[PDB]
Amino acid sequence: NDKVRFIKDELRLLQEPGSYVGEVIKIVSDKKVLVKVQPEGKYIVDVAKDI
């Protein structure tokens, strides 16, 4: 039963459009963060509710 599940988890996990590596320029206290993304532009983005 576990084995069936393991293979399945890989099949889901490997389907992704990829996430961009970026650098926090500075922290904002409205729970936004400023990130200068390596290949993209610069964006101010909404930090995770749980982060």
């Binding site: 084995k3 293979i7 399945k8």
Partner: peptide, 13 residues
């Protein structure tokens, strides 16, 4: 039953 489903999943990946 699980045996059948295990091959099909592994093939799929």
């Amino acid at each position: 039953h699980l045996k059948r489903e295990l091959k099909r999943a592994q093939e799929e990946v």
